């Protein structure tokens, strides 16, 4: 008929079993039937976030009609999803659109058993409006008056106000039905009702453990989608990943593998290679950071809380103040933690807070408000975590930011949320937030008080850092931090191992020349004793290795005294550990 | 087809003719889009990633995986057409011309039932053919895409995903974000080794293994 060439008969689709079972949502299927029987405002527009089942309510209304579970005034009605696309299509002539829509409305009045459903009712504005032609909105607006057109609509909450609301005429006629996002317990009952559809398409079996896990892990580890689908996304893709393996049981663990592939958040059950890797994680971080054992443990307590499914899910996975002297591995541990969790230290979201000392550079973190330039791409904090929710976020030099930025990041440590420029909350609950401070190094001289006093450079330096911390930060900002770690000065024995870590970068660049770099134990002892400052640590060692090894090697390579295919052995002439260690000089001899 | 040849490029016909570059690696991403395409509803992967990480290549690696039989029986012998939205807009000057072209495309997909669609630059589906009173291509596809009766691969950059697809929150739901990550340097050397014969044959040169280790490291 006229309605089949435009609309899709949902009632006929419910007779043939082509609509998904809409379990739950019953209190709002029957509420749509209440609104259709009202005096005015008798057009139910289903408003709700995209994915909560607005189309499913009317698909559940079609299944209620074919089961005889409707009132006799809505008995044997034929729901038609009038798509505007088939109504515009064709129409290569004049009035073609108004008469194809008049023939729809004449067929609704003639049979009289049609409940029209206009999915995406906001798209009614500007349909078939051709040059010298009136859109589908202007044609129906009238019919609504006569009440000769009970329609059901379905918009989002944004696009309801953005259009349908505004129209004042529509207001006294359209009635917004809240289609709420279901709870987890409601979603499990949706997934139980949808077992036989997804167990038959994928020819798998979906356990009760998987569907409880699908609705729980989707509410927890997504902030961009909505319960019904977000959890059907996990069920359907796990049954799809399972049917690639049989070419038949979807479990709790198979859902978390799909959530791990999709959000990027490791929620899946730890493999044996990765379980022992988190056991040896402090040992694996010590391959890249020397010493700082109290700090490597505290970021080890945080990652192992997360992978034991055991952190507070109202609060970020790790929250840290790294504080202490300059150069002892605060940024290096943050890079090593990101190199652990991701294999690459450029996966660290490194938000260098020293360039945020203006009051209003907080718009770089969360984005511009809408309508102000750069809103559409705004947020270098929020968008990098909207994409990678499991992240290590480094706020390096946090004390060099403005105070209004901390109040923005105060909601972060409290709720795990951050309202960005648009207004969407970005889930920070799976982030390791590291707020690197350099407080306790602006006076660092073995800090002493007055005289006659008789373990001052830590046990004491630590409380000076914590005193400079709480006088700079809000006390409610620091109570939310999980662990405030004041770092140690690097001891002389840690500088000796820091030589090996820094020669290995220089030796690795000589491997690109097919050269080796062997240092004697006296050579590493001389770099360590001239690279040791007890107040800075490891950057005086870096500068020493540049001045004494790299700048000398850069001449020897450019002289071609040493060249490719040649092991540069670094020994020291003069001095023997017992002297002051500054009359001695390195010598560079190539061997092979 | 014949309706869909003038609005699409068959990538599986291009993969049989050796006209697609080899896609080295990316097999966790081709496996991922074969999962999303094997889903019951919302069976639509959008390949999000930074520009030039190989989002278009994953589909071209998928189209090579179809014609070499390395797909499941769900994706077996699917003819993957890259829907040219620019061809689909072009010459639609009368009312409903764009919409009837897209309905004729979608009717040809339903009758054949072996067509994966690749809408490269999926963000250009919003407002595609949305003239005066002209229902865009997004509103036509959104009923088909939500119920799984249209298998469509999108590919969008991460910037164009937050600027155009996340601003139409109904449309981003219909697509599953398959994150196509940037390759590592070791993965990129593997890509260059497998692309070596295409650029040696084109430039009549020989590319040393040193040159591709350098090209991934220095870039």
């Amino acid at each position: 008929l006229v309605l089949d060439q435009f609309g899709r008969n949902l009632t006929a689709a419910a007779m043939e079993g082509k609509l998904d079972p809409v379990i739950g949502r019953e209190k709002e299927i029957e509420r749509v039937m209440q609104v259709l029987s009202r005096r005015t405002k008798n057009n139910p527009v289903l408003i709700g976030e995209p994915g909560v089942g607005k189309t499913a309510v009317v698909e559940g209304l079609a299944q209620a009609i074919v089961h005889g579970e409707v009132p006799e005034t809505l008995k044997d009605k034929q729901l038609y999803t009038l798509d505007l696309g088939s109504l515009v299509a064709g129409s290569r002539y004049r009035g073609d659109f108004e008469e194809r829509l008049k023939k729809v409305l004449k067929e609704i009045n003639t049979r009289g058993d049609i409940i029209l459903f206009i999915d995406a009712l906001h798209t009614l504005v500007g349909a078939g409006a051709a040059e010298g032609a009136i859109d589908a909105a202007s044609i129906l607006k009238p019919k609504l008056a006569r009440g000769e057109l009970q329609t059901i609509g379905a918009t989002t909450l944004d696009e309801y106000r953005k259009y349908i609301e505004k129209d004042a005429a529509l207001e006294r006629r359209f009635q917004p039905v809240q289609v709420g996002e279901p709870t987890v317990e409601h979603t499990i009952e949706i997934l139980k009702g949808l077992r036989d559809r997804y167990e038959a398409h994928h020819r798998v079996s979906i356990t009760d453990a998987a569907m409880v896990a699908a609705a729980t892990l989707a509410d927890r580890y997504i902030n961009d989608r909505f319960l019904p689908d977000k959890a059907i996304d996990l069920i359907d893709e796990a049954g799809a990943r399972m049917r690639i393996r049989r070419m038949a049981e979807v479990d709790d663990e198979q859902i978390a593998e799909v959530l791990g592939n999709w959000t990027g958040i490791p929620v899946f059950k730890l493999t044996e290679a990765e379980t022992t890797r988190l056991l040896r994680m402090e040992e694996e971080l010590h391959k890249r950071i020397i010493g700082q054992e109290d700090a490597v443990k505290a970021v080890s307590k945080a990652i192992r809380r997360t992978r034991a499914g055991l952190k507070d899910p109202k609060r970020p996975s790790g929250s840290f103040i790294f504080a202490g002297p300059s150069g002892v591995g605060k940024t290096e541990l943050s890079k090593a933690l990101a190199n652990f969790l991701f294999g690459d230290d450029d996966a660290l979201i490194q938000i260098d807070m020293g360039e945020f000392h203006d009051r209003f550079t907080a718009s770089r973190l969360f984005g511009a408000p809408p309508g102000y330039v750069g809103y559409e791409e705004g947020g270098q904090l929020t968008e990098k975590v909207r994409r990678k929710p499991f992240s290590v976020v480094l706020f390096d030099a946090i004390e060099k930011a403005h105070q209004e930025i901390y109040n923005s990041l105060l909601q972060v440590l409290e709720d795990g949320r951050l309202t960005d420029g648009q207004g969407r909350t970005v889930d920070f609950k799976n982030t390791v937030l590291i707020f690197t401070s350099n407080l306790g190094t602006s006076d660092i001289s073995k800090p002493v008080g007055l005289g006659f006093s008789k373990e001052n450079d830590y046990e004491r330096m630590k409380q000076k850092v914590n005193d400079e911390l709480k006088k700079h930060f809000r006390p409610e900002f620091l109570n939310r931090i999980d662990d405030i770690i004041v770092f140690h000065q690097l001891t002389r024995e840690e500088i000796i191992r820091m030589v090996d870590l820094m020669i290995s970068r220089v030796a690795g660049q000589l491997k690109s020349k097919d050269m080796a770099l062997v240092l004697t134990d006296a050579a590493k002892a001389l770099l360590a004793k001239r690279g040791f400052d007890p107040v800075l640590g490891a950057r005086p060692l870096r500068r020493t290795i540049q001045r004494e090894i790299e700048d000398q090697l850069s001449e020897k390579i450019l002289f071609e005294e040493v060249g490719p295919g040649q092991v540069v052995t670094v020994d020291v002439d003069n001095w023997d550990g017992e002297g002051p260690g500054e009359d001695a000089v390195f010598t560079f001899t190539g061997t092979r | 087809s014949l309706v869909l040849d003038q609005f699409g490029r068959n990538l599986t016909a291009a993969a049989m003719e050796g006209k697609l570059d080899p896609v080295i690696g990316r097999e966790k991403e081709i496996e991922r889009v074969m999962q999303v395409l094997s889903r019951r509803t919302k069976n639509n992967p959008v390949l999000i990633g930074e520009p030039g990480v190989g989002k278009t290549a994953v589909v071209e690696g998928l189209a090579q995986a179809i014609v070499h039989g390395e797909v499941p029986e769900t994706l077996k012998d699917k003819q993957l057409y890259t829907l040219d939205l620019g061809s689909l807009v072009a010459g639609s000057r009368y009312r409903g011309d764009f919409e009837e072209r897209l309905k004729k495309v979608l009717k040809e997909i339903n009758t054949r039932g072996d067509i994966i669609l690749f809408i490269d630059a999926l963000h250009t589906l919003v407002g595609a053919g949305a003239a005066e009173g002209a229902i865009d291509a997004a509103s036509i596809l959104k009923p088909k895409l939500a119920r799984g009766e249209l298998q469509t691969i999108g590919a969008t950059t991460l910037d164009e995903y937050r600027k155009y697809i996340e601003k139409d929150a109904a449309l981003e739901r219909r697509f599953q974000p398959v994150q196509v990550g940037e390759p590592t340097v070791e993965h990129t050397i593997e890509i260059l080794k497998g692309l070596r014969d295409r650029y040696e044959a084109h430039h009549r040169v020989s590319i040393t293994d040193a040159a591709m280790v350098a090209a991934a490291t220095l870039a």
């Binding site: 051709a130 032609a133 009051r359 809103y375 | 000057r93 009368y94 009312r95 003239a131 005066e132």
Partner: peptide, 24 residues
């Protein structure tokens, strides 16, 4: 003591040209 008043630039653009649908 001083305050800098910044200046929130707004996004302002000319109206969009439209493309027409023909009815013969």
């Amino acid at each position: 003591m001083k305050v800098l008043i910044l200046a929130c630039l707004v996004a302002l653009a000319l109206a969009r040209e439209l493309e027409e649908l023909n009815v013969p």
